[PDB]
Structure formats: C-alpha cells, structure tokens
Amino acid sequence: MITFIGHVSKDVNVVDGKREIAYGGGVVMGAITSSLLGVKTKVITKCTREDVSKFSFLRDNGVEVVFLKSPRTTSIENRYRESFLISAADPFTESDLAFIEGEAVHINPLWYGEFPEDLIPVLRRKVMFLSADAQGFVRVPENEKLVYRDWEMKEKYLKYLDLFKVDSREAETLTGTNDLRESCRIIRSFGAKIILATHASGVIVFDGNFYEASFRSWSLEGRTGRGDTCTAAFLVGFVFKKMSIEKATKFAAAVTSVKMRHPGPLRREDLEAI
Ligand SMILES: O[C@H]1[C@H](O)[C@@H](O)[C@H](O)[C@@H](O)[C@H]1O
Ligand SMILES: [Mg+2]
C-alpha cells in the first residue's frame, strides 16, 4: 500500500478574470495516479463534513479515504503562477498517523504549517519508504499570499526522506540557484537520498547520478498536478514495480505526459495512451 497525507482543496482558478472552481489538491492528483496504476492506495486528509461529497470521486477511483474532522476546508486561489491561501483546514497532528500501514507514505502538503516538521521523525518509524513534497515546507502564507521561503530546518529533516520532490521555484528557494541540476546536488548534500525535480520540459531524478526524461505532451489546463502525478508514478514504478531508477524516471514522465493533456487527475483512459 501507499498512503498520501495532505489536505484536499477547493481550488479557485482565475484565468483572464474568470473564476472556475476545481476540487483537487496534491493528494488527489497523487493518490488517483497510484490507484489507477494498480497500487493499493490510501489518503489521509481533512476537510469539513459538508465538503466530503466534493471529493467522493476519490473512492470512485479505488482510493481508500480517511476524512478527518476540520472546521474548515483548505481553499487556494491560483492566478495564472501566484497562489493565495483563502481558508485552511486544521493541520495534521501525531495522532493522525496512528493507523499507518503499507510500504510507502508520501507527505503532500499545500502550505507550510499543514504538516508540522515534528511529524517527520514520528512517521519515519512507521514506514519503509518515506517521501515528501517541498511545497509543504517552502510555500508560506503571508497575508494569504503563498510566498516562497527557505525551509529553515531542511538539513535536519531531509535526512529522514527516501525521496524529496521539488519543482524549479522550490529548488531555487532552497538553494539560491536556478540551475535545477545544481540545486539537486545541493539538496542531496542537505541529506535527501533521492531528489525528483519537475520543470517545464520533463523530469530529473538525482541519487548521485542524474536520470532525465522529457514530457511528450502538455496543455495549459493540464499543468496543475504535473508534479504530484509524476511523484506518484515514480513511486509506483520504483518502489512497487521494481523498476530501475532510470526506467521509473521514463515511466513517471510518460504517465505525467498523458495526464497533462487535460485538466484534473489522471484518467483510466490515459493509461491506454502510454
Ligand atoms: O499542486 C497544486 C498547487 O499547490 C495549487 O496551488 C493548488 O491549488 C492545487 O490544489 C495543487 O494541486
Ligand atoms: Mg509541486
């Protein structure tokens, strides 16, 4: 099994002054990918009881979901690449981790404070393969605006992670350089064993050696959840399907490409084009 931990979100997407609502989040994108790829998948999330029916499609895609109690549901406004945290569900606490099973857990937060760093060592002791998304540690609400700030305790916590996911902007925030390969070297030097980095043209995986695969297709509306899809597909390929790191890198790129053809999470029919 793989478990994703993170908030679902009512996304308010604003394009040319037009507001459109999507029910998503990192965990939705990632969990649907792994489930459709044939790995037993669980989500631990928080939202209001009222909003649970907006996320019922998870169960329709084979995902076991634990909807934990919160007085609010996280909602993020995205202006097209600037984001605002409109509302925030309660953060995760240690007790939310109590029923963790499976070979793999991915920490997939939307905002710094959603998943307190103290949970990292607690979770480490419960799982064989622990991964996290940098978004949850560098994207910080300041008067709602989600600003990029360095992760002060990155050197302490990266050493707990088997895999760490970044995009260009997160990598630069953590390293001071916009050279993505160099950022990977620097981030691995902080202690993370494997770095997975997404950028416009494809995927870079670094474990001491670099592996790269380019995306084969893309769309404007399809880019949200690129990284979450890519991470989940890499985890499936490498952790569960026993692929070499090089093969799992190409696999993750292929799965991401077909998801990026449309808005929303990976669809069953996408896997017939890969
Ligand atoms: O990766 C994206 C990103 O964090 C967006 O700002 C958020 O609104 C989406 O829910 C998420 O899938
Ligand atoms: Mg991302």
Author numbering: 1 to 80, 87 to 280
Quote the passages of the study that discuss this structure, keeping the authors' original sentences.
Here, we identify a PPi-dependent kinase belonging to the ribokinase family, which is distinct from the families of the previously reported PPi-dependent kinases. Accordingly, the phosphate donor specificity of TM0415 was investigated using myo-inositol as the acceptor. This analysis demonstrated that TM0415 utilizes PPi but neither ATP nor ADP to generate myo-inositol monophosphate. Structural comparison and sequence alignment with ATP-dependent or ADP-dependent members of the ribokinase family reveal the importance of five residues: two large hydrophobic residues occluding a part of the ATP-binding pocket and three basic residues specifically involved in PPi recognition. In general, the overall structure of the ribokinase family enzymes is divided into two domains: the phosphate-acceptor-binding domain (the N-terminal half) and the donor-binding domain (the C-terminal half).
In order to elucidate the PPi-binding mode of TM0415, we determined its crystal structure complexed with a PPi analog (methylenediphosphonic acid: PCP), which has a carbon atom instead of an oxygen atom in the bridge position of PPi. In an asymmetric unit, two protein molecules were found: chains A and B. Chain A was complexed with PCP, a magnesium ion, and myo-inositol, while chain B possessed a sulfate ion, which is derived from a crystallization precipitant, instead of PCP without any magnesium ions. The structures of chains A and B were very similar to each other (RMS distance 0.6 Å for 274 Cα atoms out of 275 chain B Cα atoms) and also similar to the unliganded structure (RMS distances 0.9 Å for 274 Cα atoms and 1.0 Å for 275 Cα atoms, respectively, out of 283 Cα atoms of the unliganded structure). In chain A, the phosphoryl group of PCP near myo-inositol (the proximal phosphoryl group) interacts with the main-chain nitrogen atoms of G231 and D234, while the other (the distal phosphoryl group) is surrounded by K171, T204, and R232. The two phosphoryl groups and four water molecules octahedrally coordinate with the magnesium ion, which is essential for the kinase activity. R229 is also located near PCP, but its side chain was disordered in the structure. The disorder of R229 in the PCP-complex structure is thought to result from the inability of the methylene group in PCP to form hydrogen bonds with the guanidine head of R229. In the TM0415 structure, the probable catalytic residue D234 and the proximal phosphoryl group of PCP are nearest to the 1-hydroxyl group of myo-inositol (3.7 and 3.4 Å, respectively).
